[PDB]
Subunit: 323 residues, 4 copies
């Protein structure tokens, strides 16, 4: 495994981060979840990404159990607060109340004294940033959290929060965008801004839910246990955008020669592609298959040639999404 | 139930707040107090107002017991410190000593780790605001209180305290005035000042102790179990001002047609009237009658027409108290 | 009992403070110490003055035991740190180390969660005031102490420490000088400076160890159990200054008519004299005799006429010590 | 024993500090380690120097056990954080994560609530000094550490950290350089800078691993149980520099007359030499021999004549290392 700095900080994360998102009513057995996390550790993954809301507390509980026994110095636990976990209007968002009432349950379920990275899930316009950042100061002073992150935040608001955190001794070191070969919205403004502010990216949908594994053929029936066949949760439509486009699916199939050139699967090429941006500390991978994790983990530290990066842009052409 | 922001904060309160004030020697059975709080929850009330001094600790103890089992994320607990609860000159006021010695008893009696809103009951000229605000900073850092409020405070002193709180990361978000159709002292200066400072009003005597239910006829014997018949405590004289005035009692009776126009009881009209001010986050209701609570709770989110607000002023005329 | 503000603070102290200083090898039985503290409470005394060093922890232990059961809101506990209580050079002074290692033993022996007033005993030139004041900030944040005081401090250094405390949210409200009818060193600079800085005086040797009770006749054998007969500790020489001067002893005897004029014992006149200075919050009294405490306690709130204050100066004349 | 101020602070250290460095696989029995620490206490040593990394936790555990029972006020415990103690890239360095995860193990092994001096072992360029100093602020606020130190740090970075510590109420009072008669690299810049910043030196290799005891003759077989015969760990090469130079070994032998002049062993002269610099608070001594400790301890407070300091420079000549 290769490691990077999360921003201007002393924290190193693995270049490959394991995420274990589950749906509130999910059919994936716990035994399959635990063996995937076990496969991530075997591949040298140190960094784990979860949320209170994932599985409605189940995702954090399973992770807590899988990692019990791993020495604490060897793990970076990233969790999130902001999505609804309680009934009523104080059971969500980034108020002092919701954050204070969230942290202790996250600690219990993960079986730890402190969370390495605590991420504000979504930006919440009701809470002033002075309220939020002082709430984070209190949790850092108490040693319940070490570092702060944000996911899906307007860039003006990232800068503001970084500013206040510098004043209050809150390390704001991490932003979580959607980033892949196909989705490059964050190249325009977010990564340039974040880099100046000492913030690194931990990136999600890096395989666009399997579309960048080359495993979906244009005009075909999708494979046996593929995500296309089992579309649980409101993320299935984000995938439908690409599966209902035989153009993209065919251009993704043409990357395979480029990958084999470099001695990679299409999956490893897509993961290595994200890792080529200096603004990126980590790529998150989803999988409940041990063999997929151990293989996806090997993208860590791979440099792609200037030549191969120019040919990738040519093949994908106008299917790429910018800003 | 409808919810509002308490000031410029992430905290939402219900538009209808339940208060459970008791007298130090009070004849109201506990079973009647517990069933009223139970009726408030059934009506969707999330926000509860009490004080150390109410019932001499009895009011907080009963509330603690009634709300045991309700998830913490679903409640906003507002309590007060400042009124005498101990013997001698340090057993009252807003000194570091009295506040530090008060908070832990409030937490025990309410059965909670933290109080949502901690209100300085009355302004106390002996304590410098620097002493008080640093005492509140220490309680916020420790996570024993989340937000700070004030009740019956000079407006210069609200501004001063808001200023220092912004500097020390103390959210000062709440002021508690007397406010009704008949008592509009806070329109003049308090609500305008508070609105600029990011402070919302949680309002009391919103029915002027039942006078704005239309239930008292000019020149009559007051009903069986009415507050006029059972005048316990030094709040009875504030009511006597209006009951010894057949003029007001007759003008209140003439609102009933205006209420029925809007499909409301006089009580619901009086409560909705307060809620029409943008500076108001919540109206407090007193009652030890389930049927009264469930009915008063339905004023939440009712808009009154411009027409009806002009006709209300005409009927009440010069009985209204301003500044 | 009458009460005063300790400085610009919300803390009230009794005008009569009980001190229980003992010598490291002292013959006074505990039963006599406990009954004196019991007599102080009966006289309405709320404020108690002690030190880690007094009796070598015995003075604090007895006070802790005597006051067990008294409600906490009704007491002001003043203790001191700075005098040697341990072996070696870190077993004394005002270093972070000595103060941090002192506070928990004081709390245990007094049987309390927090000390009302924590006094820096003597000024210590080795420790920078930034180190000391940050150590006091940490103890206030933790709620182990509420207010800070100083005893026998240069006035430049009182001002400096008051300045830093205002910056760090440390209430510096109390100075402890030697002050009596005969010893007026603090009138010159200390009380004027302290009054501008919001600091009140709690005063010691207010009877000059019994010399201002009129109980010592010039050219006589001192009474049976008098302090002159039992000169334990290095405070006996401070008394010898006045007992080896038949002039003063005779001028003190001539105050008795002035006292009887006002319906006071010479002791009550001497105590009331100190309390006439607006810069004074409290006079400390020593006694292990119940009848003396109950009588000395009655000086509280006595105003002396302008006439009587001019005649007192005439009688004592040039025996008075100024600066 | 003689004592000095550690910088501009209230902390006194003994002029002779005992260090107990061990190698991760070391043959020295625990019984020999415990009796050496016992000999240090008997010689009046109050100050003990160790590290998490020394013996891989064994050095701190033995020290913890040897000092159990010694009153806390009588000891200054100096430990270090920064060297690798865990697997992976967060198991080392000065990140919030590594420091937070280190302190509690150091406290447990030493059997104490707080560490007197916490030293950043090596400077770590990955961690910004704002992250580090706020991590130290949190540990001081919590009372887990009292004072902060640095070992082997660039001088620009000492100044920067001292600056931030003054702002955050972190006492930065201590630097640990290599310093002896033969190694004077720190005279050039480090001690002058440190003295202006209120930082004192606790010095190591003060005998250059026994070379300044005069016990190694040029062109000979080194004694029975001498360090030259048993070269464990990567510090043996630093010694080889001097043992492979018959010139130095012969010049060290010629100091013996100068030592006997002053009534000292060559060891006592070398230790007293370091202590002559006003910028030095303490000299660290290594030994697992009781008789060596009790003798080395007697250098404490010895003044050397101007005459003897000029003759020492003449004898050692160009073997001395400067900058
Ligand atoms: N910060 C945020 O707001 C946010 C939002 C969403 C997600 N996330 C995080 O990011 C993660 C994203 O996971 P994701 O699964 O949604 O997106 P993804 O990582 O783009 O997709 C992973 C999926 O692609 C398929 N796949 C991966 N490698 C493969 C291989 N070598 N061969 C064949 N198929 C392969 C697998 O599904 P099948 O084999 O079943 O097709 C796998 O479950 C989540 O776990 C979560 O922790 C964060
Ligand atoms: N911040 C402060 O300093 C402060 C000061 C005072 C009070 N408060 C708070 O505000 C609350 C005010 O309560 P309050 O009772 O004094 O004043 P209120 O809310 O104006 O009066 C409520 C009373 O009016 C009558 N009533 C209400 N709805 C009715 C209906 N639909 N039909 C018939 N009668 C009805 C009831 O008494 P009867 O039926 O018995 O006549 C009821 O107890 C207290 O509980 C307390 O929590 C705060
Ligand atoms: N902050 C500081 O550095 C500091 C320093 C010293 C003391 N103090 C405090 O201040 C206190 C001073 O006590 P102190 O006793 O040294 O000085 P004091 O209060 O001037 O003297 C009290 C003594 O005078 C005699 N006395 C008092 N009232 C009397 C009466 N009505 N009739 C007859 N005799 C009477 C008693 O001794 P006999 O009857 O036995 O003659 C009594 O013990 C101490 O307890 C201590 O807490 C503080
Ligand atoms: N801050 C840092 O980074 C750092 C780095 C290294 C060390 N240190 C500290 O500094 C200490 C340095 O210890 P050190 O032993 O490496 O260097 P040292 O103190 O220069 O050498 C001590 C050694 O010299 C010999 N010796 C001492 N006195 C003697 C006498 N009177 N007669 C004969 N031989 C004598 C002994 O070895 P033999 O008798 O076996 O020859 C003894 O073990 C360590 O314990 C550690 O705590 C700190």
């Amino acid at each position: 495994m290769e490691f990077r700095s999360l921003g201007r900080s002393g924290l190193s994360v693995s270049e490959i981060v394991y995420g274990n998102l589950l749906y509130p009513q999910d059919d994936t057995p716990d035994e399959v979840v635990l063996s995937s996390i076990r496969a991530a550790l075997d591949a040298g993954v140190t960094t784990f990404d979860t949320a209170d809301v994932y599985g409605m507390f189940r995702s954090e509980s399973l992770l807590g159990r899988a990692l019990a026994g791993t020495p604490r110095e060897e793990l970076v636990l990233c969790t999130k607060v902001g999505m609804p976990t309680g009934f009523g209007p104080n059971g969500r968002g980034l108020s002092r109340k919701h954050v204070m009432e969230s942290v202790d349950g996250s600690l219990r379920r993960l079986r730890v004294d402190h969370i390495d990275v605590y991420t504000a899930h979504r930006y919440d316009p009701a809470t002033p940033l002075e309220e939020l950042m002082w709430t984070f100061s209190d949790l850092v002073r108490a040693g319940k959290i070490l570092y702060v992150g944000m996911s899906e935040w307007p860039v003006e608001r990232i800068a503001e929060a970084a500013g206040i955190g510098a004043r209050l001794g809150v390390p704001v070191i991490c932003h979580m965008p959607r980033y892949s070969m196909l989705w490059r919205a964050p190249e325009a403004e977010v990564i340039p801004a974040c880099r100046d502010l000492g913030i690194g990216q931990i990136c999600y949908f890096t395989l666009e839910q399997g579309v960048l594994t080359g495993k979906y053929a244009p005009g075909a029936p999708p494979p046996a246990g593929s995500r296309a066949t089992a579309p649980k949760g409101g993320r299935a439509p984000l995938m439908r955008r690409w599966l209902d486009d035989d153009k993209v699916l065919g251009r993704v199939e043409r990357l395979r020669p480029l990958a084999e050139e470099a001695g990679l699967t299409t999956a490893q090429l897509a993961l290595a592609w994200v890792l080529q941006n200096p603004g990126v500390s980590g790529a998150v991978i989803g999988s409940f298959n041990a063999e997929q994790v151990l293989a996806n983990a090997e993208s860590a530290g791979v440099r792609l040639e200037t030549d191969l990066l120019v040919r990738i842009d040519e093949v994908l052409g106008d299917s790429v999404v910018h800003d």
